[PDB]
RNA sequence: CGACUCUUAGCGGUGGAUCACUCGGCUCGUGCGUCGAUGAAGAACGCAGCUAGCUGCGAGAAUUAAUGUGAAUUGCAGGACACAUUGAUCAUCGACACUUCGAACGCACUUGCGGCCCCGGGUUCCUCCCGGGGCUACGCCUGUCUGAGCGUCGCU
RNA sequence: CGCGACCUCAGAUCAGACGUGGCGACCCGCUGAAUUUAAGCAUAUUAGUCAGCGGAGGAGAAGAAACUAACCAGGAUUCCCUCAGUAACGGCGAGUGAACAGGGAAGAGCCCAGCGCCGAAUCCCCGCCCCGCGGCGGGGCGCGGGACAUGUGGCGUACGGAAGACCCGCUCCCCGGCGCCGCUCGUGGGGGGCCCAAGUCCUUCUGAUCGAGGCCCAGCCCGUGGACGGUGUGAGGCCGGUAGCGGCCCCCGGCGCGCCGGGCCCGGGUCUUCCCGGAGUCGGGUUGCUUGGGAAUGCAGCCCAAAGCGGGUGGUAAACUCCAUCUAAGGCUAAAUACCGGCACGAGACCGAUAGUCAACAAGUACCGUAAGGGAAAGUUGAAAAGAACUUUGAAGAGAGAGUUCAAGAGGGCGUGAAACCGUUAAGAGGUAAACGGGUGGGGUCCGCGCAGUCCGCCCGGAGGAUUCAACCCGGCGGCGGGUCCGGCCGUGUCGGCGCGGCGGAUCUUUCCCGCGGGGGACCGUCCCCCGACCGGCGACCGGCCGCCGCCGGGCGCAUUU
RNA sequence: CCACCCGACCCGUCUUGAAACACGGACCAAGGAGUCUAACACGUGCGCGAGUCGGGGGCUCGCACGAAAGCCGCCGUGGCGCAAUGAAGGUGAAGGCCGGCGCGCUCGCCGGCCGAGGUGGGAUCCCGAGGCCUCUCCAGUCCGCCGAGGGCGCACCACCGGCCCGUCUCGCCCGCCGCGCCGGGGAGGUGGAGCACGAGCGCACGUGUUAGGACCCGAAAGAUGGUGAACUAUGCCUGGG
RNA sequence: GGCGAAAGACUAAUCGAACCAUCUAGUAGCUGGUUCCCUCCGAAGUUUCCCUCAGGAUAGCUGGCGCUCUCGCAGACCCG
RNA sequence: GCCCCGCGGACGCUACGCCGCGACGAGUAGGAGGGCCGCUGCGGUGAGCCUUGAAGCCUAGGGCGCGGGCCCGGGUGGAGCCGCCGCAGGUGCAGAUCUUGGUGGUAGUAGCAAAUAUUCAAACGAGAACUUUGAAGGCCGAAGUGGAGAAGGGUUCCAU
């Protein structure tokens, strides 16, 4: 029964909710268990990076997030092809590969191609046989530099280009931003009915 | 403070394990201090009490300097009977009175092959801990 | 309580007309249990009223800023001898508050060394007070692994542990806190400010980095500065006695006018 | 004057509150996460010197072997080769053992009735009788053997 | 006629294997209510939930797009936060209700059929020998058997693939037994066993003590051990234990290098040419269920029934057109996730015998019901049985003495022992049932224990005694004052300047460096340090010095004083 | 404990009305009923503040306490708040004076200044003629209180005006890569949970409201799956009288 | 559902729908109960709407929390 | 000259404290405040209490508080317990034909009345209306109060 002024509420408690209640008393225990597994995995895979293989830069979709980049699932086959890395070899040396991803633009492709090349320079490759090295990193390089890289490999950061202050030209001062948007919307809205009418008069005249 | 996560501090648990301990564990529970001369001789502080061990009662109504022999180790009752530690029942029968082994001091040990092996284990370990403390 | 408690029975009400209360009653016969009330909070063997649930809200959130403020107030009160003594910390022979000792204490390895140092700094009387407080708890807590209760002693605060914890852990009443991770539950036991704390030099020097000053922010916290006083001068006596206040006041009226008996 | 009745106190009963105790619950958490035709889960019956229940065990029956341990077990008794150090007891448990019913398996569920093979006995030399051992369930897979078909063909 | 081959079938206690049933907390596939809410009730809700059936594993299922999107695009599955009580559904009522993007936990990818090419290059069984060798097998052999061209294996799968030519770079990988043993494997690989500090000192309390006091010099002693339990209270030091990258022994496993029993062994690039895909399935209609999915989200039945520049999707039915995006109708796959059953284990602001599980006990027991099923009550002597010898009355139950014990005023359902109710004793009372409020009176019990009952301060008088008072001197301390006493310092401000000082900055950088951006610099802000002048003030903190005052100790003061 | 005088019916409950010939209650002990979770509202306390908040995750050689605590900042993703309005496409909160003009709308272009309008009330604050007085007179200084009267006016209230969005009536003017079935502007009304120099966020407590067993006890009923023909009903078989 | 020479009879003391367990602590505008003390304030049975008339929503009546202001003085004393 | 024959002059002000003046005081349903009212457990604290006697319980003992309640004495008891500052809740009973356990008045009452019937003597025995033996009087009356079975019971059979 409502009483005086209040919000109309519809609590979703008409089923046997008490039978399905997930408590979180094992949350501290879960965090401990995940931590120990991370540490155990890192010791097992040393000196390979603890977080995992390197991931590519990808741009988040939709208008809400296209201004930001993040780590992708894996490098595309085109990116690996340009970088000169066989897709089968990439996984063994710590490069994630995503055959599903396609590069729509060349800016994204070059960003990840550069990321792969810069990763390859940073990579220290131990010989399969310690006594015999063929094309692996130098003994000196392996002996000292090799250490387990903690945290994401080459974290993906949103870079912002600084734009220095400048004198406003006459053209910029005369640019009508509001009217440009208003007409651009109408041009897109009426483009078809204009193509229909313009076409319709064409056979009318001819 | 206890730090082992696999060792319990529970009062109910420790009492349960104590009062339901099997006999061979009850042997360890029924340890008694050695006398000063024995402690100095063997470098051992305590031994599990055995029948045919001479002891002194150092606590209770029968406390004194008399050296008596342990005639029965009743592990099920956690008590020992000593040869002169007795009392007079109503009808005149003489019954031993149970004394907890932690309240007696061994003055003479019944040495055989097993006790000598046990004694040299405790003394080797006590000495090894000195090589720690130092 | 168990969710099944009080309901592991097929009891059913006899209804009216049988000269008994309409509570559910156990079915069957041939035993004492048959015909007895069930399911009720008022019935022997029934379910308590509103059985306790595990999804009670046990835990509480406190804002990080409010948690940090409490550490600042606790630390500030630990430097006031009136407030430390008010916590019964026996510091009458302590040379100074706050009590700071050289960093080689962090390297102590033996409990004898820790005991001797507490004697030299005249903090041992607090440990002896802890010993005198060792007693048995009153009530059901004795059956629930809380038999012995004692009092809180000095709180040793260190920066880097090179053995200090092992050396002091066996002394009753001693709480050891890393300065980087300060605990309000340890610094203000019982919710009362003014626990006697002993600092090492390194831990003491780090406090301006952990909590900052009013002129520079903390360097070991992303965004924290010390809280602001809403009363810079707390000495109420000096303010009232000050000539600025006195010249503004009216003359006090002290003549007590009592009831006049009307004749 | 007593009874009787009531009230209050002392003491005695009747009753089992209260307090103290707790080898039991409840809740949370952790690690592991393993049953069975090589007979499970469950059930029945039996097993101790005295023992009915509980417990343990299976005709080797309140346990065998082994390993660890190191002098008990115990309510009473008995055994100095059954009172043991040449190993009591306890623990572990990897060896051996493990009755009947039970998915339950010859059939049937009455300790009802068979069949096949082998061994011993009845002087067995046949039949037959007794005892003992092995086997004899349904479905299904691969393979083997024996076959069926006016199914499709080949040769004569 | 018959003899053979195959096909389709059948029998066997044929040789060798496999399934059944259980548990079921969590998981998968079905089936599936009504109570209830809607203030009635039928759609709705309850709920794809309970009950019912089937199938598993330590996880299960899911899973590498016939995906999301519409962006500068993301990129298997699962889980968490958020999206969000939202879009949507709904007698548009009650009510119901996802997803994508984003941030995380985890992260792993792959295999067939087809299409081709390779002399079936393939597999199972059997027999023998040799070697590792509880059957796990490796190889060799066999004019041994069978499967199999109605298609086994190698290569290859949508990320393309194959062959040929030309170029470039090469000799790898794996499994089982070497030995020695490298190895926080993470709290020191795992499992089992056996050990490891220090008071029973002195005095006393007590039935017993673990109580109390003491144990020179900070010292009873150990403490990496002051968790816990036991022991006649209440124990770090009596005992087990506890702490310890403590010891010893035994067993088990992965890794690390070390001959072999052995197998296995080419790759990448470019060019030319060839090859390229899952059908009573998709899709359509209709029906029923389902969903937030709304002119139909998913599923199924029936009918219709494909295509190959096709097909699916693109959240409003339809036609045309462009574009985007994937490639269905075959299959495998760890992790992150779940776990009221089980095997071990730890803990708790929980309960404390009418509570907590029904069950602290010979509890799913006794008992009840034909049965399915229902289902209790019930803990405590004492430190130790020392469980009351013996005498005496009685047929005995039961008493009276005696005895044990600190206690039987603990005597075997025995700690404590309430109330209701009863017996007895003492006191009081009693014909308007009792009881009750207010007021007094009488009696009784006990208390004050009263029962000679104000002390405190000052002054006066008598009668004593003294470490004797004031003042002054010498030490020590303290309070207050002196910042135009001196250090120390502090508050703030200006100038120059220090540490390339630190940190930040949506300031600038063709000084300059290199791979088209990061560096490194300048500036600004801030802080920190230092350095001269200079700066108000010293309960912010602070010493020395001086002045005053006060106290204390010592000296003198030796009596009209104190 | 008893006596006497005055007063004095049995409580709980429902009820207009209970001592009731209304119901429950023989007696005593122990147990016995507004809880907890989610949501929402307001009020109060605390922190920070145009922000606020890590709750999920991670780091700290996990682990008596500690399953705590501390930290993160290119972990603030995200929530709520800072912007409303419309069904939606969408649009989206600043004006007043000083001039120089044009136009005659009552407006429009330019430079300036200022910077969230105005009116009535308004805690507080500011100024304040005049006053009060010392042993007296001459004029002064420090220097409080009284003060008519005036001024700046917090918050808040009311009223007028203004700004944004929807909608309507009216009427002209302007823009250009889109000369368009294009885009923008004014004025007068009216609809909005808007603006008009922010007040929120997190945490805690209380009270109320609700969904939940929902303060406790209580139906007649409904559903699912099972157990019963040892009584009895009926058929059959085989016996007895 | 059975069974009924029919009485809604009988179907294990149960029959106009057996018994057992579960759903299920089913719902109840209805009946009963709802546990310490003192202090201060203190009602309503009326309005409107409701398949409403033993119930609610609504306004009234209540309490709690406030907040916005108004009103002080000749005076340590006495004294406009 | 401010001080000085005298060197001194009560209490106060837990400011959440203390003090003064005036007016007021009914209360169901209901609201709010205070509680040094009460229960259980947790963090602090009381150099708290306790085998020289804790909790509990009893009390014609002594008192305090308007009250909720509390303190103390005595008795009993035999191992634990409490104050204060905060925290937390399964926190306060007279009722619910409340739940479970116990106990009364009724009350030494109703009742121990269906089917004809017992008596004498002896034995054993502590004890005899009731057992046994003997004697007498009776009944069942062969459709039995007789002798044997089925079902069901499950040792009830027999001896001591
Ligand atoms: K043995
Ligand atoms: K269909
Ligand atoms: K009496
Ligand atoms: K009533
Ligand atoms: K009545
Ligand atoms: K509620
Ligand atoms: K019979
Ligand atoms: Mg990760
Ligand atoms: Mg427990
Ligand atoms: Mg339940
Ligand atoms: Mg009655
Ligand atoms: Mg219960
Ligand atoms: Mg208590
Ligand atoms: Mg405490
Ligand atoms: Mg009594
Ligand atoms: Mg009794
Ligand atoms: Mg053996
Ligand atoms: Mg038969
Ligand atoms: Mg066979
Ligand atoms: Mg199965
Ligand atoms: Mg479990
Ligand atoms: Mg309804
Ligand atoms: Mg209803
Ligand atoms: Mg209805
Ligand atoms: Mg459904
Ligand atoms: Mg189910
Ligand atoms: Mg399994
Ligand atoms: Mg998995
Ligand atoms: Mg694919
Ligand atoms: Mg996804
Ligand atoms: Mg939201
Ligand atoms: Mg629909
Ligand atoms: Mg639904
Ligand atoms: Mg997402
Ligand atoms: Mg093939
Ligand atoms: Mg020891
Ligand atoms: Mg003890
Ligand atoms: Mg101890
Ligand atoms: Mg000691
Ligand atoms: Mg250890
Ligand atoms: Mg397409
Ligand atoms: Mg389209
Ligand atoms: Mg596969
Ligand atoms: Mg009890
Ligand atoms: Mg119980
Ligand atoms: Mg029970
Ligand atoms: Mg006693
Ligand atoms: Mg006696
Ligand atoms: Mg007594
Ligand atoms: Mg007693
Ligand atoms: Mg008793
Ligand atoms: Mg009276
Ligand atoms: Mg200061
Ligand atoms: Mg009436
Ligand atoms: Mg009444
Ligand atoms: Mg009447
Ligand atoms: Mg009634
Ligand atoms: Mg009655
Ligand atoms: Mg009670
Ligand atoms: Mg608030
Ligand atoms: Mg924050
Ligand atoms: Mg813990
Ligand atoms: Mg944390
Ligand atoms: Mg934000
Ligand atoms: Mg954001
Ligand atoms: Mg105004
Ligand atoms: Mg226009
Ligand atoms: Mg408008
Ligand atoms: Mg409200
Ligand atoms: Mg009910
Ligand atoms: Mg119905
Ligand atoms: Mg029959
Ligand atoms: Mg008939
Ligand atoms: Mg009729
Ligand atoms: Mg039945
Ligand atoms: Mg209820
Ligand atoms: Mg009604
Ligand atoms: Mg209507
Ligand atoms: Mg009516
Ligand atoms: Mg009524
Ligand atoms: Mg009143
Ligand atoms: Mg008194
Ligand atoms: Mg509780
Ligand atoms: Mg309660
Ligand atoms: Mg009661
Ligand atoms: Mg009441
Ligand atoms: Mg009679
Ligand atoms: Mg009679
Ligand atoms: Mg007759
Ligand atoms: Mg006759
Ligand atoms: Mg006849």
Swiss-Prot record, chain A:
Pfam families found in the cross-reference section: Ribosomal_L13e (PF01294)
UniProt keyword annotation of ATP-binding present: no
N6-acetyllysine: residues carrying this PTM: 15, 176
GO BP term, example: blastocyst development
Identification of the protein by name: Large ribosomal subunit protein eL13
Tissue specificity: Higher levels of expression in benign breast lesions than in carcinomas.
Key words of the record: Acetylation, Cytoplasm, Disease variant, Dwarfism, Isopeptide bond, Phosphoprotein, Ribonucleoprotein, Ribosomal protein, Ubl conjugation
From Swiss-Prot, chain B:
Pfam family, one: KOW
Gene Ontology CC: cytoplasm; cytosol; cytosolic large ribosomal subunit; cytosolic ribosome; extracellular exosome; membrane; nucleolus; nucleoplasm
UniProtKB keywords: Cytoplasm, Diamond-Blackfan anemia, Isopeptide bond, Phosphoprotein, Ribonucleoprotein, Ribosomal protein, Ubl conjugation
Record localization: Cytoplasm
SUPFAM superfamilies xref list: Translation proteins SH3-like domain
Related illness: Diamond-Blackfan anemia 11: A form of Diamond-Blackfan anemia, a congenital non-regenerative hypoplastic anemia that usually presents early in infancy. Diamond-Blackfan anemia is characterized by a moderate to severe macrocytic anemia, erythroblastopenia, and an increased risk of malignancy. 30 to 40% of Diamond-Blackfan anemia patients present with short stature and congenital anomalies, the most frequent being craniofacial (Pierre-Robin syndrome and cleft palate), thumb and urogenital anomalies.
Protein name, per record: Large ribosomal subunit protein uL24
Provenance organism: Homo sapiens (Human)
GN (gene name): RPL26
From Swiss-Prot, chain C:
Cross-link type Glycyl lysine isopeptide (Lys-Gly) (interchain with G-Cter in SUMO2), residue numbers: 186
Phosphothreonine carried by residues: 213
Keywords, sorted A to Z: Acetylation, Citrullination, Cytoplasm, Isopeptide bond, Methylation, Phosphoprotein, Ribonucleoprotein, Ribosomal protein, Ubl conjugation
UniProt modified residues of type N6-acetyllysine: 53, 206
Sequence positions bearing Citrulline: 247
Omega-N-methylarginine: residues carrying this PTM: 44
Subcellular location: Cytoplasm
Residues bearing the modification Phosphoserine: 237, 242
Biological process, per Gene Ontology: cytoplasmic translation; translation
One of the record's GO molecular function terms: structural constituent of ribosome
One Gene Ontology cellular component: nucleus
Modification after translation: Citrullinated by PADI4.
Functional description taken from the UniProt entry: Component of the large ribosomal subunit. The ribosome is a large ribonucleoprotein complex responsible for the synthesis of proteins in the cell.
Family: Belongs to the universal ribosomal protein uL4 family.
Subunit relationships: Component of the large ribosomal subunit. May bind IPO9 with low affinity. Interacts with RBM3.
Protein name listed in UniProt: Large ribosomal subunit protein uL4
Organism field: Homo sapiens (Human)
This protein's encoding gene: RPL4
């Amino acid at each position: 029964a409502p009483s005086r002024n209040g919000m109309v509420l519809k609590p979703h408690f008409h089923k046997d909710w008490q039978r399905r209640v997930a408590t979180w008393f094992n949350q501290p225990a879960r965090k401990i268990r995940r931590r120990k597994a991370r540490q155990a995995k890192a010791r097992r895979i040393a000196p390979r990076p603890a977080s995992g293989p390197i991931r590519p830069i990808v741009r988040c979709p939709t208008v809400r997030y296209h201004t930001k980049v993040r780590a992708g699932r894996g490098f595309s086959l085109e990116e690996l092809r340009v970088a000169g890395i066989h897709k089968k070899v990439a996984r063994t040396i710590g490069i994630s590969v995503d055959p599903r991803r396609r590069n729509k633009s060349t800016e994204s492709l070059q960003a990840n191609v550069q990321r792969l090349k810069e990763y390859r320079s940073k990579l220290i490759l131990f010989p399969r046989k310690p006594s015999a090295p063929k094309k692996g990193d130098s003994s000196a390089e392996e002996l000292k530099l090799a250490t387990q890289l903690t945290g994401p490999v080459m974290p993906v950061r949103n870079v912002y280009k600084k734009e220095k202050a400048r004198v406003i030209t006459e053209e910029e001062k005369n640019f009508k931003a509001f009217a440009s948007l208003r007409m651009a919307r109408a041009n897109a809205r009426l483009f078809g009915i204009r193509a229909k009418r313009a076409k319709e008069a064409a056979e009318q005249d001819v | 403070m206890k730090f082992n996560p696999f060792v319990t501090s529970d009062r109910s648990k420790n009492r349960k394990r104590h009062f339901n301990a099997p006999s061979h564990i009850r042997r360890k529970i029924m340890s008694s201090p050695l006398s000063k001369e024995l402690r100095q001789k063997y470098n051992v502080r305590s031994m599990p009490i055995r029948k045919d061990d001479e002891v002194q009662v150092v606590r209770g109504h029968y406390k004194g300097q008399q050296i008596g022999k342990v005639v029965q180790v009743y592990r099920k009752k956690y008590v020992i009977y000593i040869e002169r530690v007795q009392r007079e029942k109503a009808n005149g029968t003489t019954v031993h009175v149970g004394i907890h082994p932690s309240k007696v001091v061994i003055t003479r040990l019944k040495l055989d092959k097993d006790r000598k092996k046990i004694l040299e284990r405790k003394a080797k370990s006590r000495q090894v801990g000195k090589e720690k403390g130092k | 309580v168990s969710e099944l408690a009080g309901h592991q029975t097929s009891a059913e009400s006899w209804g009216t007309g049988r000269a008994v209360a309409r509570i559910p009653r156990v079915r069957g016969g041939g035993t004492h249990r048959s015909g007895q009330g069930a399911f009720g909070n008022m019935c022997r063997g029934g379910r308590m009223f509103a059985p306790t649930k595990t999804w009670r809200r046990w835990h509480r959130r406190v804002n990080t800023t409010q948690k940090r403020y409490a550490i600042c107030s606790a630390l500030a009160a630990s430097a006031l001898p009136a407030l430390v003594m008010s916590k019964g910390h026996r510091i009458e022979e302590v040379p100074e508050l706050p009590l700071v000792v050289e960093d080689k204490v962090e390297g102590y390895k033996k409990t004898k060394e820790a005991v001797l140092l507490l004697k030299k700094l005249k903090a041992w009387n607090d440990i002896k007070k802890v010993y005198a407080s060792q007693r048995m708890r009153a009530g059901k807590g004795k059956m629930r692994n809380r038999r012995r209760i004692q009092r809180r002693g000095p709180c040793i605060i260190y920066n880097e542990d090179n053995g200090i914890i092992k050396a002091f852990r066996n002394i009753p009443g001693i709480t050891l806190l890393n300065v980087s991770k300060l605990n309000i539950l340890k610094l203000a036991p019982g919710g009362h400010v003014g626990r006697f704390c002993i600092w090492t030099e390194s831990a003491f020097r780090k406090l301006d980095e952990l909590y900052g000053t009013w002129r520079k922010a903390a360097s070991l916290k992303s965004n924290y500065n010390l809280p602001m006083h809403k009363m810079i001068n707390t000495d109420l006596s000096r303010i009232l006695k000050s000539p600025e206040i006195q010249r503004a006041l009216r003359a006090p009226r002290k003549k007590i006018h009592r009831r006049v008996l009307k004749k």
